[PDB]
Amino acid sequence: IVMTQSPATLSLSPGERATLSCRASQSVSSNLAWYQQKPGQAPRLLIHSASSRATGIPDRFSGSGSGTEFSLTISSLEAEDVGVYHCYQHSSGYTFGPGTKLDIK
Amino acid sequence: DYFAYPLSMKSYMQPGSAGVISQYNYKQSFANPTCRIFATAPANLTITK
Amino acid sequence: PQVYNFNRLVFTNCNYNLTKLLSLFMVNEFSCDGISPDAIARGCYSSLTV
Amino acid sequence: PSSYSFISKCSRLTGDNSHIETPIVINPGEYSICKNFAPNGFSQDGDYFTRQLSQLEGGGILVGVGSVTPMTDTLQMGFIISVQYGTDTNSVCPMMDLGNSTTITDKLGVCVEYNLYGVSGRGVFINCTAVGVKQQRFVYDGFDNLIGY
Amino acid sequence: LGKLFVSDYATKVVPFNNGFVVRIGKIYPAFMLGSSVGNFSNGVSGRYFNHTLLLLPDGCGTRLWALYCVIEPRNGSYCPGNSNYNTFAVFDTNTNATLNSFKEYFDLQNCSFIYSFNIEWFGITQNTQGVHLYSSRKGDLYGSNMFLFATLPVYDGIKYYTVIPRSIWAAFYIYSLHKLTYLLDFSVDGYIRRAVDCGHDDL
Amino acid sequence: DVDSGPPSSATSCKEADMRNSSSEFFNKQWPMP
Amino acid sequence: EVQLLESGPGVVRPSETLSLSCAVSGGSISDSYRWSWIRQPPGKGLEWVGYIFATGTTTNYNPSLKSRVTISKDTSKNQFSLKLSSVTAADTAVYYCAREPFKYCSGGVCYAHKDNSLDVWGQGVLVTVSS
Ligand SMILES: *[C@@H]1O[C@H](CO)[C@@H](O[C@@H]2O[C@H](CO)[C@@H](O[C@@H]3O[C@H](CO[C@H]4O[C@H](CO)[C@@H](O)[C@H](O)[C@@H]4O)[C@@H](O)[C@H](O[C@H]4O[C@H](CO)[C@@H](O)[C@H](O)[C@@H]4O)[C@@H]3O)[C@H](O)[C@H]2NC(C)=O)[C@H](O)[C@H]1NC(C)=O
Ligand SMILES: *[C@@H]1O[C@H](CO[C@@H]2O[C@@H](C)[C@@H](O)[C@@H](O)[C@@H]2O)[C@@H](O[C@@H]2O[C@H](CO)[C@@H](O)[C@H](O)[C@H]2NC(C)=O)[C@H](O)[C@H]1NC(C)=O
Ligand SMILES: *[C@@H]1O[C@H](CO)[C@@H](O[C@@H]2O[C@H](CO)[C@@H](O)[C@H](O)[C@H]2NC(C)=O)[C@H](O)[C@H]1NC(C)=O
Ligand SMILES: *[C@@H]1O[C@H](CO)[C@@H](O[C@@H]2O[C@H](CO)[C@@H](O)[C@H](O)[C@H]2NC(C)=O)[C@H](O)[C@H]1NC(C)=O
Ligand SMILES: *[C@@H]1O[C@H](CO)[C@@H](O)[C@H](O)[C@H]1NC(C)=O
Ligand SMILES: *[C@@H]1O[C@H](CO)[C@@H](O)[C@H](O)[C@H]1NC(C)=O
């Protein structure tokens, strides 16, 4: 399939309601993850279902969605969260998203 | 011997059925060479549902 | 239950209303070996396994 | 139920680098060793299970995989019916009204159709000295033919 | 009573192929039949998983309980769920005598059925119709023929049985059953007093 | 579904003297084929 | 905890095979569902290279790799390696050792879905094709 992430380079400010968005070519059976990659780092998993938060992730993260549309929602824009956010799908094949990008102002 | 019959109930016309079709509606006779046939009538011909 | 975890009932010394059972369920296809469904309905047997 | 489900793979992976995949099959009328993973039903299609069989079970790794199909509008059931003849003193009978229990004191020496505790036929009943076991209601001869009652 | 004098029977696990027949004598054997067998938290073998069949004599020989439960080893001292565990046995001091001793070791949960039979030779077989119990008491007491007295709705194939130690030299012998051909001589009264095993020898 | 009676209240199990088949008490053979 | 360090060269000539070795340091190979390889060309997104089942010799690969990739396991040394043949300048990337975990390993039973999200990753070894 062909995943996509809409907000391209969504620079932000400390304290927001940051809302990402990842859309799939066809519906996935909620088998969508979220990964976060700091510059020069192995990607670090965030969510392993529509909104099934993973261990060690601060509670501020809560994605949502099913089928063909998804999102990742962050309110507390903390300096230890600036980076890149891919979306991964294993419903058909195994592919990663284009990759977003965030920064402070 | 022809009659209207749903395909879903074709199991109730098999030899040896204990259902209501064999007891009260029809029971096939095997005294002659016989065949049982379930089909579908033509859609827009003279046969009226 | 599912096919691999089927429930088995054994009857030995009882009477049952086969008309009630057939009035409820709607048979789609049956295939018998060594006995016929009507034979079960018109006679007794030492056991019945379901 | 939530959905129809059944076992798709049930194999023993032996030893070495798990390079032998021996499938474990069932005998007619018996259960599967992979039923203990999800006895109530498989949650999703293609679920993977592993288990370490002990020395009392042949050894190796038991890998089980199940498949799930969606539920239909109407629940569809499957039945396997088996019967036995001549293996009990009593019997299972359907609701067939044979009438009422009759007496043979007026019919000794006369051939009468009978249905005695599920055993039916025709024969001639003659008063006799008791032979065979009392609790075993039927005395059969050397050819499985009833000769006493 | 002090310490219990028992044997290694609680830890041995033996196969259940075609069933077994038991010669009694007076004491009555206690059995633990199940399908899946492993070992406890202490490394001692003899743990039965899932539903297990118990044949526990009770009432000073006047009753035979039959249970199909899931036994959970309790974690108390000297119990199967503890760090120290040698064996388990059923002991007398009441129609619930030996059953109460068993509950001191295991906790019975999900008991499908509990049966009691009022009560030599004993035998057990399994078939598509369940586990069948046989006894010579239903026939003539002086006789040795075993008669069916209980059909039990246990349809998982029993593969192992364990003799539970009992602490009241009463000795009993367990023989394995085989799919053999026999020549049974029925007398006039119907009981078998002479048999030939066809595969025993040439004659 | 059977009640099976109340759970036992015994806090600890009773110690049992373990004897192997090699002990004279249980090694006695009285054949009964 | 499982940490996955990997080792291999950094410079591979055209048509010369590329071998990497990722050794697991927590638990063992047989305490997981399947072990997978992930690559990422510089600034071009991630990419799935293939995976190997922990139990059995069943393996799956990316069809876009033209069956040039062989990933095997060796329980003796507690490692699983990767071989990509006929390497090109377009194949230069950073290769991430990965793991797919069971949802639970309780009693003696481990239960995992048919496809799960990669959970614990290695640091990654950066390769290059040049002369
Ligand atoms: C014969 O006996 C064996 C026991 O030896 C049975 O095997 C057990 O089967 C049950 C039922 O399938 C299993 O129960 C499941 O256990 C999971 C354990 O994972 C976590 O939970 C425990 C709880 O303390 C933790 O200690 C453990 O470390 C894990 O963190 C549970 O997660 C399951 O609960 C969930 O199940 C599904 C998940 O999709 C959903 O319904 C719910 O979300 C639910 O919460 C479940 O309870 C058990 O693990 C098996 N092993 C053991 C040792 O008990 C056989 O099933 C039995 N054979 C039969 C009955 O035929
Ligand atoms: C039916 O037979 C019983 C049993 O008697 C046996 O069979 C007879 C044909 C004869 O061969 C007897 O010697 C056998 O013992 C009869 O019951 C007996 O009847 C006799 C005569 O009245 C009496 O002295 C006995 O005590 C009875 N014994 C028992 C156990 O009841 C019975 O009377 C016969 N009935 C008819 C209608 O013929
Ligand atoms: C077996 O069960 C059937 C179904 O309950 C019984 O048939 C019922 O008979 C009563 C008697 O008047 C009717 O009022 C019901 O309408 C019948 N139900 C049906 C036809 O579904 C039948 O009587 C039972 N067998 C016996 C021997 O009593
Ligand atoms: C002996 O113990 C058994 C436990 O299995 C008792 O049987 C149960 O007793 C409880 C409480 O009296 C009842 O609620 C259950 O219905 C009984 N079940 C069965 C299968 O019997 C038994 O009652 C005890 N004996 C006496 C004399 O009380
Ligand atoms: C007890 O059970 C464990 C379960 O894995 C097994 O490894 C061990 O070998 C068993 N004990 C013996 C003496 O076999
Ligand atoms: C066993 O008993 C427990 C206790 O109530 C119950 O929660 C569970 O559903 C029972 N299991 C079965 C299979 O009946």
PDB file of N, CA, C and O in Angstrom, chain C residues 8, chain E residues 33 51-53 67-68 113 126-131 151-158:
ATOM      1  N   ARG C   8     -19.944 -33.373  23.802  1.00  0.00           N
ATOM      2  CA  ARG C   8     -20.487 -34.694  23.527  1.00  0.00           C
ATOM      3  C   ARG C   8     -21.537 -35.042  24.572  1.00  0.00           C
ATOM      4  O   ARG C   8     -21.270 -34.968  25.776  1.00  0.00           O
TER       5      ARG C   8
ATOM      6  N   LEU E  33      -6.867 -40.067  38.020  1.00  0.00           N
ATOM      7  CA  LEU E  33      -6.771 -40.222  36.574  1.00  0.00           C
ATOM      8  C   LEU E  33      -6.959 -38.870  35.900  1.00  0.00           C
ATOM      9  O   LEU E  33      -7.880 -38.122  36.245  1.00  0.00           O
ATOM     10  N   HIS E  51      -9.147 -30.826  33.869  1.00  0.00           N
ATOM     11  CA  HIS E  51     -10.061 -31.658  34.636  1.00  0.00           C
ATOM     12  C   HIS E  51      -9.428 -33.010  34.927  1.00  0.00           C
ATOM     13  O   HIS E  51      -8.914 -33.678  34.024  1.00  0.00           O
ATOM     14  N   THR E  52      -9.462 -33.410  36.193  1.00  0.00           N
ATOM     15  CA  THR E  52      -8.908 -34.678  36.642  1.00  0.00           C
ATOM     16  C   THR E  52      -9.999 -35.503  37.305  1.00  0.00           C
ATOM     17  O   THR E  52     -10.885 -34.959  37.971  1.00  0.00           O
ATOM     18  N   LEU E  53      -9.937 -36.816  37.113  1.00  0.00           N
ATOM     19  CA  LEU E  53     -10.918 -37.740  37.664  1.00  0.00           C
ATOM     20  C   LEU E  53     -10.360 -38.362  38.938  1.00  0.00           C
ATOM     21  O   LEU E  53      -9.269 -38.943  38.924  1.00  0.00           O
ATOM     22  N   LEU E  67     -15.175 -37.730  41.311  1.00  0.00           N
ATOM     23  CA  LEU E  67     -15.113 -36.304  41.043  1.00  0.00           C
ATOM     24  C   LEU E  67     -14.368 -36.046  39.743  1.00  0.00           C
ATOM     25  O   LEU E  67     -13.427 -36.763  39.395  1.00  0.00           O
ATOM     26  N   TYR E  68     -14.800 -35.010  39.027  1.00  0.00           N
ATOM     27  CA  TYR E  68     -14.144 -34.546  37.806  1.00  0.00           C
ATOM     28  C   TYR E  68     -13.947 -33.045  37.972  1.00  0.00           C
ATOM     29  O   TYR E  68     -14.767 -32.245  37.515  1.00  0.00           O
ATOM     30  N   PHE E 113     -18.953 -32.897  37.846  1.00  0.00           N
ATOM     31  CA  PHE E 113     -19.900 -33.771  38.522  1.00  0.00           C
ATOM     32  C   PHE E 113     -19.223 -34.413  39.722  1.00  0.00           C
ATOM     33  O   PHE E 113     -18.020 -34.682  39.701  1.00  0.00           O
ATOM     34  N   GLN E 126     -12.212 -46.776  29.245  1.00  0.00           N
ATOM     35  CA  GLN E 126     -12.702 -45.574  28.592  1.00  0.00           C
ATOM     36  C   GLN E 126     -13.115 -45.895  27.165  1.00  0.00           C
ATOM     37  O   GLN E 126     -12.517 -46.743  26.498  1.00  0.00           O
ATOM     38  N   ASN E 127     -14.152 -45.203  26.708  1.00  0.00           N
ATOM     39  CA  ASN E 127     -14.756 -45.444  25.410  1.00  0.00           C
ATOM     40  C   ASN E 127     -15.297 -44.115  24.901  1.00  0.00           C
ATOM     41  O   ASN E 127     -15.208 -43.089  25.578  1.00  0.00           O
ATOM     42  N   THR E 128     -15.860 -44.137  23.693  1.00  0.00           N
ATOM     43  CA  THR E 128     -16.460 -42.931  23.139  1.00  0.00           C
ATOM     44  C   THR E 128     -17.636 -42.442  23.974  1.00  0.00           C
ATOM     45  O   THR E 128     -17.977 -41.256  23.913  1.00  0.00           O
ATOM     46  N   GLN E 129     -18.246 -43.318  24.767  1.00  0.00           N
ATOM     47  CA  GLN E 129     -19.392 -42.964  25.591  1.00  0.00           C
ATOM     48  C   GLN E 129     -19.011 -42.562  27.010  1.00  0.00           C
ATOM     49  O   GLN E 129     -19.903 -42.282  27.817  1.00  0.00           O
ATOM     50  N   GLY E 130     -17.729 -42.528  27.340  1.00  0.00           N
ATOM     51  CA  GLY E 130     -17.270 -42.065  28.631  1.00  0.00           C
ATOM     52  C   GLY E 130     -16.426 -43.104  29.336  1.00  0.00           C
ATOM     53  O   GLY E 130     -16.066 -44.145  28.778  1.00  0.00           O
ATOM     54  N   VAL E 131     -16.100 -42.803  30.587  1.00  0.00           N
ATOM     55  CA  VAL E 131     -15.341 -43.710  31.438  1.00  0.00           C
ATOM     56  C   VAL E 131     -16.313 -44.652  32.132  1.00  0.00           C
ATOM     57  O   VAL E 131     -17.264 -44.210  32.788  1.00  0.00           O
ATOM     58  N   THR E 151     -21.392 -45.131  34.509  1.00  0.00           N
ATOM     59  CA  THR E 151     -20.879 -44.508  33.297  1.00  0.00           C
ATOM     60  C   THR E 151     -20.679 -43.026  33.577  1.00  0.00           C
ATOM     61  O   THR E 151     -21.610 -42.342  34.013  1.00  0.00           O
ATOM     62  N   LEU E 152     -19.469 -42.537  33.327  1.00  0.00           N
ATOM     63  CA  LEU E 152     -19.094 -41.196  33.738  1.00  0.00           C
ATOM     64  C   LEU E 152     -18.861 -40.313  32.525  1.00  0.00           C
ATOM     65  O   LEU E 152     -18.140 -40.713  31.603  1.00  0.00           O
ATOM     66  N   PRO E 153     -19.446 -39.114  32.490  1.00  0.00           N
ATOM     67  CA  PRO E 153     -19.265 -38.234  31.331  1.00  0.00           C
ATOM     68  C   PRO E 153     -17.892 -37.584  31.287  1.00  0.00           C
ATOM     69  O   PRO E 153     -17.771 -36.360  31.405  1.00  0.00           O
ATOM     70  N   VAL E 154     -16.853 -38.396  31.120  1.00  0.00           N
ATOM     71  CA  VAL E 154     -15.490 -37.924  30.920  1.00  0.00           C
ATOM     72  C   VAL E 154     -15.077 -38.359  29.523  1.00  0.00           C
ATOM     73  O   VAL E 154     -14.855 -39.553  29.280  1.00  0.00           O
ATOM     74  N   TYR E 155     -14.972 -37.402  28.604  1.00  0.00           N
ATOM     75  CA  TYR E 155     -14.756 -37.720  27.202  1.00  0.00           C
ATOM     76  C   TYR E 155     -13.377 -37.336  26.691  1.00  0.00           C
ATOM     77  O   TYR E 155     -13.017 -37.731  25.577  1.00  0.00           O
ATOM     78  N   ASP E 156     -12.600 -36.582  27.460  1.00  0.00           N
ATOM     79  CA  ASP E 156     -11.189 -36.420  27.146  1.00  0.00           C
ATOM     80  C   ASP E 156     -10.458 -37.721  27.445  1.00  0.00           C
ATOM     81  O   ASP E 156     -10.649 -38.320  28.507  1.00  0.00           O
ATOM     82  N   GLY E 157      -9.632 -38.163  26.504  1.00  0.00           N
ATOM     83  CA  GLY E 157      -8.932 -39.420  26.663  1.00  0.00           C
ATOM     84  C   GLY E 157      -7.973 -39.419  27.832  1.00  0.00           C
ATOM     85  O   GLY E 157      -6.977 -38.689  27.823  1.00  0.00           O
ATOM     86  N   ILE E 158      -8.261 -40.229  28.849  1.00  0.00           N
ATOM     87  CA  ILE E 158      -7.366 -40.333  29.991  1.00  0.00           C
ATOM     88  C   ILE E 158      -6.103 -41.063  29.564  1.00  0.00           C
ATOM     89  O   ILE E 158      -6.161 -42.160  28.992  1.00  0.00           O
TER      90      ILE E 158
END
